[PDB]
């Protein structure tokens, strides 16, 4: 199938033009040229347009592929950045939480020691309070310490 080759076309054109041939034989050469050309032209116009619509569909999908590739690459850079940021914050959170647990324990241990001294000072205040009317000079020295502020009772560094 397909169109005649240039050589079969010329042999048929030569048979058509050969006066030595029977005029039926030359009519046959003519019908072949006719039917070949009618099909050739139609299949040529089909190939012509159907190739032009491969070309623009290709040029279209190719250009859409150009941007999608840039877009995906940019996403991969963000995932790498985001994983480094997540890990950095995770590491900071775990370590800072350990520091919280430590300080929480410190606050407990200081409170127990603070409360111990406080109760001793409060008991002595209550004892001195019971004897205020005696105006004992030693009790009054103790009372001056008991009610001294942190500016009237400096603690060294």
Residues 36-95, interacting with a copy of itself (CB under 8 A): 37-38, 40-41, 43-44, 47-48, 50-51, 54-55, 57-58, 61-62, 64-65, 68-69, 71-72, 75-76, 78-79, 82-83, 85-86, 89-90, 92-93
17 lies in the binding site for a copy of itself (CB under 8 A): yes
User: Of 1, 96, 129, 133, which one interacts with a copy of itself (CB under 8 A)?
Assistant: 96
Q: Which is nearer to a copy of itself, 25 or 148 (CB)?
A: 148
Q: Which is nearer to a copy of itself, 25 or 92 (CB)?
A: 92
| CA distances (Å), origin 48, targets 3, 34, 39, 60 | 15, 21, 14, 19
Alpha-carbon distance of 28 to 22, in angstroms, equals 10
DSSP 87-104: HHHHHHHHHHHHHHHHHH
Tokens representing 124? 């002595």
CA atoms within a 13 Å half-sphere pointing along the CA-CB vector of 18: 15
21 lies in the binding site for a copy of itself (CB under 8 A): no
User: Of 20, 24, 112, 135, which one interacts with a copy of itself (CB under 8 A)?
Assistant: 112
CB of 5 to a copy of itself, least distance (A): 7
Q: How far apart are the first and last CA of the chain?
A: 109
Q: Any residues with CB less than 8 A from the CB of 40 and at least 6 apart, and which?
A: 3
Which residues from 128-147 bind a copy of itself, rule CB under 8 A?
Answer: 128, 131, 134, 136, 138-139, 141-142, 145-146
Tokens representing 92? 């900071």
């Amino acid at each position: 199938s397909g169109p005649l080759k240039p050589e079969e076309h010329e042999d048929i054109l030569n048979k058509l033009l050969d006066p030595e041939l029977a005029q039926s034989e030359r009519t046959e050469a003519l019908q072949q040229l006719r039917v070949n050309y009618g099909s050739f032209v139609s299949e040529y116009n089909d190939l012509t347009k159907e190739k032009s619509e491969f070309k623009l569909e290709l040029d279209d999908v190719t250009s859409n592929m150009e941007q999608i590739i840039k877009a995906k690459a940019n996403l991969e850079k963000m995932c790498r950045t985001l994983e480094d940021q997540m890990n950095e914050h995770r590491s900071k959170a775990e370590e800072t939480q350990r520091s919280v647990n430590d300080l929480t324990s410190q606050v407990e241990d200081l409170e127990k020691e603070r409360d111990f001294y406080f109760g001793k000072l409060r008991n002595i205040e209550l004892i001195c309070q019971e004897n205020e009317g005696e105006n004992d000079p030693v009790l009054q020295r103790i009372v001056d310490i008991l009610y001294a502020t942190d500016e009237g009772f400096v603690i060294p560094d």
